[PDB]
Design a binder for this molecule. Sequence first.
Ligand SMILES: *[C@@H]1O[C@H](CO)[C@@H](O[C@@H]2O[C@H](CO)[C@@H](O[C@@H]3O[C@H](CO[C@H]4O[C@H](CO[C@H]5O[C@H](CO)[C@@H](O)[C@H](O)[C@@H]5O[C@H]5O[C@H](CO)[C@@H](O)[C@H](O)[C@@H]5O)[C@@H](O)[C@H](O[C@H]5O[C@H](CO)[C@@H](O)[C@H](O)[C@@H]5O)[C@@H]4O)[C@@H](O)[C@H](O[C@H]4O[C@H](CO)[C@@H](O)[C@H](O)[C@@H]4O[C@H]4O[C@H](CO)[C@@H](O)[C@H](O)[C@@H]4O[C@H]4O[C@H](CO)[C@@H](O)[C@H](O)[C@@H]4O)[C@@H]3O)[C@H](O)[C@H]2NC(C)=O)[C@H](O)[C@H]1NC(C)=O
Ligand SMILES: *[C@@H]1O[C@H](CO)[C@@H](O[C@@H]2O[C@H](CO)[C@@H](O[C@@H]3O[C@H](CO[C@H]4O[C@H](CO)[C@@H](O)[C@H](O[C@H]5O[C@H](CO)[C@@H](O)[C@H](O)[C@@H]5O)[C@@H]4O)[C@@H](O)[C@H](O[C@H]4O[C@H](CO)[C@@H](O)[C@H](O)[C@@H]4O)[C@@H]3O)[C@H](O)[C@H]2NC(C)=O)[C@H](O)[C@H]1NC(C)=O
Ligand SMILES: COc1cnc(-c2csc(C(=O)NCCO)n2)c2[nH]cc(C(=O)C(=O)N3CCC([C@@H](C#N)c4ccccc4)CC3)c12
Ligand SMILES: *[C@@H]1O[C@H](CO)[C@@H](O[C@@H]2O[C@H](CO)[C@@H](O[C@@H]3O[C@H](CO)[C@@H](O)[C@H](O)[C@@H]3O)[C@H](O)[C@H]2NC(C)=O)[C@H](O)[C@H]1NC(C)=O
Ligand SMILES: *[C@@H]1O[C@H](CO)[C@@H](O[C@@H]2O[C@H](CO)[C@@H](O[C@@H]3O[C@H](CO)[C@@H](O)[C@H](O)[C@@H]3O)[C@H](O)[C@H]2NC(C)=O)[C@H](O)[C@H]1NC(C)=O
Ligand SMILES: *[C@@H]1O[C@H](CO)[C@@H](O[C@@H]2O[C@H](CO)[C@@H](O)[C@H](O)[C@H]2NC(C)=O)[C@H](O)[C@H]1NC(C)=O
Ligand SMILES: *[C@@H]1O[C@H](CO)[C@@H](O[C@@H]2O[C@H](CO)[C@@H](O)[C@H](O)[C@H]2NC(C)=O)[C@H](O)[C@H]1NC(C)=O
Ligand SMILES: *[C@@H]1O[C@H](CO)[C@@H](O[C@@H]2O[C@H](CO)[C@@H](O)[C@H](O)[C@H]2NC(C)=O)[C@H](O)[C@H]1NC(C)=O
Ligand SMILES: *[C@@H]1O[C@H](CO)[C@@H](O)[C@H](O)[C@H]1NC(C)=O
Ligand SMILES: *[C@@H]1O[C@H](CO)[C@@H](O)[C@H](O)[C@H]1NC(C)=O
Ligand SMILES: *[C@@H]1O[C@H](CO)[C@@H](O)[C@H](O)[C@H]1NC(C)=O
Ligand SMILES: *[C@@H]1O[C@H](CO)[C@@H](O)[C@H](O)[C@H]1NC(C)=O
Ligand SMILES: *[C@@H]1O[C@H](CO)[C@@H](O)[C@H](O)[C@H]1NC(C)=O
Ligand SMILES: *[C@@H]1O[C@H](CO)[C@@H](O)[C@H](O)[C@H]1NC(C)=O
Ligand SMILES: *[C@@H]1O[C@H](CO)[C@@H](O)[C@H](O)[C@H]1NC(C)=O
Ligand SMILES: *[C@@H]1O[C@H](CO)[C@@H](O)[C@H](O)[C@H]1NC(C)=O
Ligand SMILES: *[C@@H]1O[C@H](CO)[C@@H](O)[C@H](O)[C@H]1NC(C)=O
Ligand SMILES: *[C@@H]1O[C@H](CO)[C@@H](O)[C@H](O)[C@H]1NC(C)=O
Ligand SMILES: *[C@@H]1O[C@H](CO)[C@@H](O)[C@H](O)[C@H]1NC(C)=O
Ligand SMILES: *[C@@H]1O[C@H](CO)[C@@H](O)[C@H](O)[C@H]1NC(C)=O
Ligand SMILES: *[C@@H]1O[C@H](CO)[C@@H](O)[C@H](O)[C@H]1NC(C)=O
Ligand SMILES: *[C@@H]1O[C@H](CO)[C@@H](O)[C@H](O)[C@H]1NC(C)=O
Ligand SMILES: *[C@@H]1O[C@H](CO)[C@@H](O)[C@H](O)[C@H]1NC(C)=O
Ligand SMILES: *[C@@H]1O[C@H](CO)[C@@H](O)[C@H](O)[C@H]1NC(C)=O
Ligand SMILES: *[C@@H]1O[C@H](CO)[C@@H](O)[C@H](O)[C@H]1NC(C)=O
Lengths: 38, 442, 133, 133, 133, 128
Amino acid sequence: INNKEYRLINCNTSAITQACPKVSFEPIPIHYCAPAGF
Amino acid sequence: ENLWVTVYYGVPVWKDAETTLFCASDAKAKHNVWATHACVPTDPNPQEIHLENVTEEFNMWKNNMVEQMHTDIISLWDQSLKPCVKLTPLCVTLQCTNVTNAITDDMRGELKNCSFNMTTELRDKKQKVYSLFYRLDVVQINNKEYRLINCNTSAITQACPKVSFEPIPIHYCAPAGFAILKCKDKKFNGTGPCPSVSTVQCTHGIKPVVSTQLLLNGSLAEEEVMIRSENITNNAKNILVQFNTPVQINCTRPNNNTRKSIRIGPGQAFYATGDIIGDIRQAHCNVSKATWNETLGKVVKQLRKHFGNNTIIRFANSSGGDLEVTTHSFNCGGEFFYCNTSGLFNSTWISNGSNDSITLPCRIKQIINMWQRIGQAMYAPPIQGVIRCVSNITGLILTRDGTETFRPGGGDMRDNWRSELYKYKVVKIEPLGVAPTRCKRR
Amino acid sequence: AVFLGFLGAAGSTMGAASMTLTVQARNLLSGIVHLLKLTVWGIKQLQARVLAVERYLRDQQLLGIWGCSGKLICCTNVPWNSSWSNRNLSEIWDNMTWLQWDKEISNYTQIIYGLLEESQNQQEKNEQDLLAL
Amino acid sequence: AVFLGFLGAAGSTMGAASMTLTVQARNLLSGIVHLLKLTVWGIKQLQARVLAVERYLRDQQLLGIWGCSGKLICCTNVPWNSSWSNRNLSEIWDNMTWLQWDKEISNYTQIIYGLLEESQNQQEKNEQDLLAL
Amino acid sequence: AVFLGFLGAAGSTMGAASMTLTVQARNLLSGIVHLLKLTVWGIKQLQARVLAVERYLRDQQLLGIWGCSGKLICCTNVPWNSSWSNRNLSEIWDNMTWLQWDKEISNYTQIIYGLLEESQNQQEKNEQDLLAL
Amino acid sequence: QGQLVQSGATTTKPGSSVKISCKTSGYRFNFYHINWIRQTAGRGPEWMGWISPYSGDKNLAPAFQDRVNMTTDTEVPVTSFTSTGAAYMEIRNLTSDDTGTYFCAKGLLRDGSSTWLPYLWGQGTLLT
Ligand SMILES: *[C@@H]1O[C@H](CO)[C@@H](O[C@@H]2O[C@H](CO)[C@@H](O[C@@H]3O[C@H](CO[C@H]4O[C@H](CO[C@H]5O[C@H](CO)[C@@H](O)[C@H](O)[C@@H]5O[C@H]5O[C@H](CO)[C@@H](O)[C@H](O)[C@@H]5O)[C@@H](O)[C@H](O[C@H]5O[C@H](CO)[C@@H](O)[C@H](O)[C@@H]5O)[C@@H]4O)[C@@H](O)[C@H](O[C@H]4O[C@H](CO)[C@@H](O)[C@H](O)[C@@H]4O[C@H]4O[C@H](CO)[C@@H](O)[C@H](O)[C@@H]4O[C@H]4O[C@H](CO)[C@@H](O)[C@H](O)[C@@H]4O)[C@@H]3O)[C@H](O)[C@H]2NC(C)=O)[C@H](O)[C@H]1NC(C)=O
Ligand SMILES: *[C@@H]1O[C@H](CO)[C@@H](O[C@@H]2O[C@H](CO)[C@@H](O[C@@H]3O[C@H](CO[C@H]4O[C@H](CO)[C@@H](O)[C@H](O[C@H]5O[C@H](CO)[C@@H](O)[C@H](O)[C@@H]5O)[C@@H]4O)[C@@H](O)[C@H](O[C@H]4O[C@H](CO)[C@@H](O)[C@H](O)[C@@H]4O)[C@@H]3O)[C@H](O)[C@H]2NC(C)=O)[C@H](O)[C@H]1NC(C)=O
Ligand SMILES: COc1cnc(-c2csc(C(=O)NCCO)n2)c2[nH]cc(C(=O)C(=O)N3CCC([C@@H](C#N)c4ccccc4)CC3)c12
Ligand SMILES: *[C@@H]1O[C@H](CO)[C@@H](O[C@@H]2O[C@H](CO)[C@@H](O[C@@H]3O[C@H](CO)[C@@H](O)[C@H](O)[C@@H]3O)[C@H](O)[C@H]2NC(C)=O)[C@H](O)[C@H]1NC(C)=O
Ligand SMILES: *[C@@H]1O[C@H](CO)[C@@H](O[C@@H]2O[C@H](CO)[C@@H](O[C@@H]3O[C@H](CO)[C@@H](O)[C@H](O)[C@@H]3O)[C@H](O)[C@H]2NC(C)=O)[C@H](O)[C@H]1NC(C)=O
Ligand SMILES: *[C@@H]1O[C@H](CO)[C@@H](O[C@@H]2O[C@H](CO)[C@@H](O)[C@H](O)[C@H]2NC(C)=O)[C@H](O)[C@H]1NC(C)=O
Ligand SMILES: *[C@@H]1O[C@H](CO)[C@@H](O[C@@H]2O[C@H](CO)[C@@H](O)[C@H](O)[C@H]2NC(C)=O)[C@H](O)[C@H]1NC(C)=O
Ligand SMILES: *[C@@H]1O[C@H](CO)[C@@H](O[C@@H]2O[C@H](CO)[C@@H](O)[C@H](O)[C@H]2NC(C)=O)[C@H](O)[C@H]1NC(C)=O
Ligand SMILES: *[C@@H]1O[C@H](CO)[C@@H](O)[C@H](O)[C@H]1NC(C)=O
Ligand SMILES: *[C@@H]1O[C@H](CO)[C@@H](O)[C@H](O)[C@H]1NC(C)=O
Ligand SMILES: *[C@@H]1O[C@H](CO)[C@@H](O)[C@H](O)[C@H]1NC(C)=O
Ligand SMILES: *[C@@H]1O[C@H](CO)[C@@H](O)[C@H](O)[C@H]1NC(C)=O
Ligand SMILES: *[C@@H]1O[C@H](CO)[C@@H](O)[C@H](O)[C@H]1NC(C)=O
Ligand SMILES: *[C@@H]1O[C@H](CO)[C@@H](O)[C@H](O)[C@H]1NC(C)=O
Ligand SMILES: *[C@@H]1O[C@H](CO)[C@@H](O)[C@H](O)[C@H]1NC(C)=O
Ligand SMILES: *[C@@H]1O[C@H](CO)[C@@H](O)[C@H](O)[C@H]1NC(C)=O
Ligand SMILES: *[C@@H]1O[C@H](CO)[C@@H](O)[C@H](O)[C@H]1NC(C)=O
Ligand SMILES: *[C@@H]1O[C@H](CO)[C@@H](O)[C@H](O)[C@H]1NC(C)=O
Ligand SMILES: *[C@@H]1O[C@H](CO)[C@@H](O)[C@H](O)[C@H]1NC(C)=O
Ligand SMILES: *[C@@H]1O[C@H](CO)[C@@H](O)[C@H](O)[C@H]1NC(C)=O
Ligand SMILES: *[C@@H]1O[C@H](CO)[C@@H](O)[C@H](O)[C@H]1NC(C)=O
Ligand SMILES: *[C@@H]1O[C@H](CO)[C@@H](O)[C@H](O)[C@H]1NC(C)=O
Ligand SMILES: *[C@@H]1O[C@H](CO)[C@@H](O)[C@H](O)[C@H]1NC(C)=O
Ligand SMILES: *[C@@H]1O[C@H](CO)[C@@H](O)[C@H](O)[C@H]1NC(C)=O
Ligand SMILES: *[C@@H]1O[C@H](CO)[C@@H](O)[C@H](O)[C@H]1NC(C)=O
C-alpha cells in the first residue's frame, strides 16, 4: 500500500472465487465425436 | 355410386393454433438487450404467398402472438440484467445540494449534486464520493438528506453499459407445419372476416419500442386512419388509433453529461454522473403544430363514425396514474424521457401556427421500475454527451370517459405489440385429407 | 403454368388443390427453424425444431398404418358410408374447398381413421397367406 | 369382437398376437409426451419427447434397409437357418408367445438383421438391371 | 469378401460404391449420440441428437416426394438432359467417384430435384385415374 | 484434362541402356495404368507394357519379357483429384534395331474391360 500493509492482487481489478476443493484439476482424456450424419 | 375413401397428403387446410414463435433478424454485425444477434438470419426474399379466394377470421384481442411477444421482451430484459451490477451499496444516506443554482426558481432541485460514503475495493475502508442525480430518483428524509427512490420497495441493478437499448427490427416466424396468415385488408378493423388473406413464413420487421400514450417508430395505415378497440362502446377498453401519415417528433436532452466510474468493490463499478459541461438546460420534444393538428383532425373524423356526425369530441390530458402512464414515457438514446403531453391533448372539436411547433417539457429518470413485478428496478447508466433522437408518432393509446372526451395513457406493454401484430394469425397445417372417389386399392 | 405457391390453392376447388400437393408437402419440415445456446431465443428455436419433426412424423405414422407410406394420393378399400357426406362427386371436387370440406367431415374423421387402420392390418395378413405357396 | 388393448395379447400365442399389431404400432409415438420452459418438469418432458422419436425412427430405419417400409407383416428372401430355432411352425405360432420367443432367438437377432440388410441391397440392384431394357 | 467399411468406397468408382450403400445408410442415425441434465456436455449432446434426426428426415422427405420411400436404388421417369453432364455411362460408373461427380453435377442438383418432384405428383394422379374403373 | 511430357530425344549406340521418363499432370496419377508403346520404322507399332502407379503391378509383352524394367515413383497430391507422377523405362540387351519413336500413354478407365487401354498419349521421343 505504501508500512507492512498488503492486499490481494485482484482486489482492484476482479472479484475472486475459490475453487470448490473437491474438484480435480487433473486433465482427463477427452474424445470429441460428431453427430450422426456427420 | 361406388365410392371409397381416398387419402391425400398435403391438403391446403389449416386450423387455428398456438405455437412457439422464434425470432428472425437481419445482418448488422454491439449487442442490444433484444439479443437480435441470436436470431436466425431473415431471408433477403421475404416470401409472401397470396391465398386467393380465402377469407379468414381474425381477432387481435385474442391473438396469442401478442401474449407471447409480451413475455419474450420481458425475458430479454431479465436475461440481460442478470449478470450486471447489483447497486445495493448505493442505498445509503445521501448529502445532497442543488447543482449550480440561480436559473428559474423551482427548476434547480430537478437535478441534485449528492455526495455519499461508499465501499471501496477494500472491505474495511470507506470513500466519500459524489454523483449527480435527477430529482425523480431521490426522496427526502425530513435537513438536506436524501435517498434513492427505490430503496424501500426494490433492489436495483444497473444495466451493463455495453448493451444497447436501441430497438432492432424483430421478425416472428412459425415452425414448420405451422403458418402465419396476414390480413391484407387496407381498412381492417382488428376483428371479423378479413377478405384479402396472404400467408408468410415470418412477420415483418417489428421494432420492440416500449412507449406510453404515443406509439413511436411503428407501422402506418395505407388508407384513412384506423381505430381499434374490442368494445368501443365500453369506455374501459383502450382505443388504439393508427395514423397513415407520420407526425414527426424531435426529442433531446441538451445537457452535456459526463459519466464518472466509481469502484464500489472488486470487479464492481458504479457509473455515476460526473458533472454537466456547459449550460444546464431543459430536455424536451418538438412536434410540428401544423401536422399534429391535421393528424389530430383525422382521428376526430374516424372517431365520428363510432359516435355520430353531430356529436362533439374533446381531448384532455392524462387523468392520473403512475409517472410512466401520465406522460409520454419512452427511451431516447439510453435515457428514459417522461414528457408532459398537456400541449398535445388540449382541444375541443366542433360537429363540423403553420410555422412554429409545439414543445413538450420532459423530465428524466434513471431508476426505472419493472412494470410487471414489484421489488425489481433498473438503474440506467448515465449517457455522455448531448442526446437527440428523431422518430415518428405512428399511433396513439387513448381512453374514453363515457360531449365525448378522450385522454391518453396505457401502461400495458402488450397494447404496444397489438398495434403491430393485429394483421397476423397463427394456424397449424393439417395435410391429411380423406374424401370419396371411385378409386379402389388393388 | 400456374404455380400458386404454398397454400396458394387453399380457396380453390378440391380437385384443383389435389394437383399441387407437393407444394405443401415439402414445407412440412423445412423453413428456417449451429450451436445450441440456451438463451431466450435459443430455447424458443429448439422447441420450434422438435415441434416440427414431431408433428411431421405423426402424419407419416398414420400414413404408414394405412399402407400409404410415401404417397400423396393413395386409394383404399374402405367404402364411403354416405352418412359421412351424401354429397355427389361433381359437387365435391368441382365445388367445395378442402377447408370447408374438412369442416363438415370433421365428426367422422376419427371413424374413417379406424377403418383405414384395420383394413391395412387385414390386407397385409391376406398378402402373407397368398405368398405361403 | 375381442380388442384386448395395447399389449393386450402379450401373453397370447404368436399367431394371435400377429393379428393386433396396429394396436401397438400407433402408440409408439403418441401418448401425452406448448412453450418450452426449462423447469425440472420441462427438461424432463423435452427429453421424453426427443427419446420417443429417436427410438421410433431407429425401428423404421431397420424396416427401411430391409425393404419393409410402412409394413406390419413383410416377407423376405432370407431362409430360416434351423440352428436359429429348430422348432416347428405349429409349435411356434400356436404355442409360444412373442416374449419367450424373443428370449430364445435373442442370440441370432443381430445375425438375421444382417441377412435382411444385404438381401435388400442386392434385390434393388437386381430390379435396376431388369429395368435396364 | 471386401467390406471396406463406412465411407470405405469414397474413392472407388461410382459403380463400385453403388454396391455398398447400406454401409452408409445405417450410420445416418445411430452412433453414440439417460436423463437430460443441461450441463455444458448435456446441452451439447442434446443438440447432437436433434441434429441427426433433423438431417435424416430431410433426406427421407425428398426421397418420399420422389416416390422412392425406403429405397436405395430407385429409377425415375426424368430423362437425363445432356446439358447436365455429356459424359457417357462407361466413363461415369467405371471412372468417376461420387465425390467428384457431385462436384460437377452440383449446379443442376436443384433442377433435377424439381423434375423428380412433379413427376411423382403426376404419376400418382395417373395411377388414381387408372384405378377409377 | 491430362498431360504426359516425355524426356529428351537423345541417342546412344548398341549395347547400352537408356531411361525414358514420363511426367503426368491434370489427373490422379495412381488411378490409371501407364503404358509404353513403340513405333518402329521397320515394324508395326508394338505395345511394350503397362504398369500400375497404384498397385505397382506390371505386365509386358513376352517379346520384352526379360529385357525391360518398368518403374514409377509415388505421386504428389496437388488437389483432391490432381497429382503429378513419373514413369520410367529401361532396356537391357539393347541394339540399334530397336530404333524409333517411343510414347507413354495412360489407361482409359478405372474399371471394366478396357481398364489399362492407352488413351492419353505423350509427344514421343526420338531415339538412336
Ligand atoms: C424545438 O423548438 C425549440 C423552440 O423553438 C428550439 O429551441 C431553440 O433552440 C435554439 C438553439 O438551442 C435557440 O437559439 C438560440 O437563440 C439565441 C437568441 O437568438 C435570437 O436573439 C438574438 C438577439 O436578439 C437581440 O439582438 C437583435 C439584434 O441582433 C435584436 O433584434 C433583438 O430584439 C435583441 O435585441 C434587443 O432585445 C434585447 C432583450 O430582448 C435587449 O437586451 C437588446 O439591447 C435589444 O434591445 C438575435 O440576434 C437572433 O437572430 C439570429 O437568428 C435569426 C433567427 O431567429 C436569424 O435571422 C439570424 O441567424 C440571426 O443571426 C435571434 O433572433 C441565440 O443567441 C443563440 O445563439 C448564441 O448562443 C449559442 C449558445 O449560447 C452560441 O453557441 C451561439 O454561437 C450564439 O452565440 C452568439 O451570440 C451571443 C449573443 O450575442 C454572443 O454573446 C456570442 O459571442 C455569439 O456571437 C457570435 O455569433 C453571433 C451570431 O450567432 C454574431 O452576431 C456575433 O458577432 C458573434 O460572431 C441560439 O442560437 C432558440 O432560441 C430556441 N428557441 C426559443 C424559442 O428560444 C429547439 O431548437 C427546437 N428543436 C429541437 C429541440 O430539436
Ligand atoms: C483405388 O484406385 C485404384 C486405381 O484406380 C484401383 O485399382 C484398380 O482397380 C480396378 C478394379 O478393381 C482394376 O481393374 C481391373 O483390372 C484387372 C487387370 O488386372 C489383372 O491383370 C493383372 C496383370 O495381368 C494381374 O496380375 C492381376 O491378377 C492379380 O495380381 C495383382 C497383383 O498385384 C493383384 O493386385 C490383383 O488384384 C489380382 O489378384 C489382375 O487380375 C482386370 O482383370 C479387371 O477386369 C475384370 O473385372 C471387371 C470388373 O471389375 C470386368 O468388367 C472385366 O470383364 C474383368 O472380369 C478390371 O478391369 C485396375 O486394374 C486397378 N488398377 C489401376 C486402375 O491402376 C483400386 O481398386 C481402388 N480401390 C479403392 C478401394 O477405391
Ligand atoms: C425496465 O423494467 C425492468 C427494470 N429492472 C429489471 C430487472 C433488474 S434485475 C432483473 C433480473 O435479474 N431478473 C431475473 C429474475 O427476475 N430484472 C427488469 N427485468 C425485466 C424488465 C422489463 O422487461 C420491464 O419491466 N419493462 C421493459 C422495458 C421498458 C421500458 C423500455 N425500453 C420503458 C420504461 C419506462 C418508460 C418507457 C419505456 C418498460 C418495462 C425489467
Ligand atoms: C458537486 O459537489 C462537489 C462537492 O462535494 C464539488 O466538488 C468540489 O468542487 C470544487 C469546485 O470546483 C472543488 O474546489 C476546487 O478545487 C480546485 C483544485 O484545487 C481549485 O483550483 C478551485 O479553485 C476549487 O477550490 C473541490 O475540490 C471539489 N471537491 C471534490 C471532492 O470533488 C463538485 O464540483 C460539484 N459538482 C457540480 C457539478 O456542481
Ligand atoms: C426511432 O427510429 C430512429 C431511426 O431508426 C431512431 O434514431 C436513431 O437514434 C439513435 C440514438 O438516438 C442513433 O444512434 C446515434 O447515432 C449518432 C450518430 O452516429 C451517435 O452520435 C449516437 O451516439 C448514437 O449512436 C441513430 O443514428 C438514429 N438513427 C437514425 C436513422 O436517425 C430513434 O432513436 C428511434 N426512436 C425510438 C424511440 O425508438
Ligand atoms: C461535451 O463535452 C465534452 C468534454 O466534456 C466535449 O468533448 C470535447 O470535444 C472537442 C471537439 O471539438 C475535443 O477537441 C475535446 O478534446 C473534447 N474534450 C473531451 C474532454 O473529451 C464535447 O465536444 C461536448 N459536446 C458538445 C455537443 O458540446
Ligand atoms: C426534426 O429534426 C429534423 C432533422 O434535424 C428536421 O428535418 C430537417 O428539416 C429541414 C427543413 O429545412 C431539412 O432541410 C432537413 O434536410 C431535414 N433533416 C432531415 C434529416 O430530414 C425536422 O424538420 C425537425 N422537426 C421538428 C418538428 O423539429
Ligand atoms: C417516418 O415515416 C416516413 C414515412 O413513412 C419514413 O420514410 C419512409 O421510409 C421508407 C423506408 O423503407 C422509404 O421506403 C419511404 O420512401 C420513406 N417515405 C418518406 C415519405 O420519407 C421514415 O423512415 C420514418 N422514420 C422513422 C424514424 O420511423
Ligand atoms: C491494480 O493495482 C495494481 C497495483 O500494483 C496495479 O498494478 C494495477 O494496474 C491496478 N489495476 C487497475 C485496473 O488499475
Ligand atoms: C434547490 O432549489 C429550490 C429552488 O430555489 C429550493 O426550494 C430548494 O430548497 C433547493 N434545495 C437545496 C438542497 O438547495
Ligand atoms: C461519511 O461518514 C462520516 C463518518 O465518518 C460522516 O461524518 C459523514 O457525514 C458521511 N458522509 C456522507 C456524505 O454521508
Ligand atoms: C417508499 O417510500 C416512498 C417515499 O416517498 C413512499 O412514497 C412509498 O410509498 C414507499 N413504499 C412503500 C412500499 O412503502
Ligand atoms: C370491427 O369491424 C368489423 C367488420 O365487420 C365489425 O363487424 C365489428 O363490429 C367491428 N368492431 C368494432 C368494435 O368496431
Ligand atoms: C360493451 O359495453 C357495453 C357497456 O359498456 C355493454 O352493454 C356491451 O354488452 C359490451 N359489448 C360486449 C360485446 O361485451
Ligand atoms: C356522416 O358524414 C359523412 C360525410 O362526412 C357521410 O359520408 C356519412 O354517410 C355520414 N353518416 C351519418 C350516419 O350521418
Ligand atoms: C393536466 O392539465 C391541468 C391543467 O393545468 C393540470 O393542472 C394537470 O396537472 C395536468 N395533468 C398532467 C398529468 O399533466
Ligand atoms: C404539464 O404542463 C401543464 C402546462 O403546460 C401544467 O399545468 C401541468 O402541471 C404539467 N404536468 C406536470 C405533471 O407537471
Ligand atoms: C354407416 O355407419 C353406421 C355407423 O357409423 C353403420 O351402422 C352403418 O351400417 C354404415 N352403413 C354403411 C352403408 O356403411
Ligand atoms: C358434429 O357433431 C356436432 C355435435 O353437436 C353436431 O352439432 C354437428 O351437426 C355434427 N356434424 C356432422 C357433420 O355430423
Ligand atoms: C447356418 O449358419 C451357420 C453359421 O451361423 C452357417 O455356417 C451354416 O452354413 C448355415 N446353414 C444354413 C442351412 O443356412
Ligand atoms: C446365447 O448365448 C449364451 C452365451 O452364454 C448361451 O448361454 C445361450 O445358451 C445362447 N442361447 C442360444 C439360444 O443360442
Ligand atoms: C435441357 O434443359 C434446358 C434448360 O435447363 C431446356 O431448355 C432444354 O429444352 C432441355 N433439353 C432436353 C433435351 O431436355
Ligand atoms: C474420368 O473422369 C475425369 C474427371 O475429370 C475425366 O477428366 C476423365 O476424362 C474421365 N475418363 C474418361 C476415360 O473419360
Ligand atoms: C456452375 O456455376 C458456376 C458459376 O460461376 C460456374 O462457374 C461453373 O462452371 C458451373 N458448373 C457447371 C458444371 O455448370
Ligand atoms: C528396376 O530398377 C530398380 C532400380 O533400383 C531395381 O531395384 C529393380 O530391381 C529393377 N527391376 C528388375 C526386374 O531388375
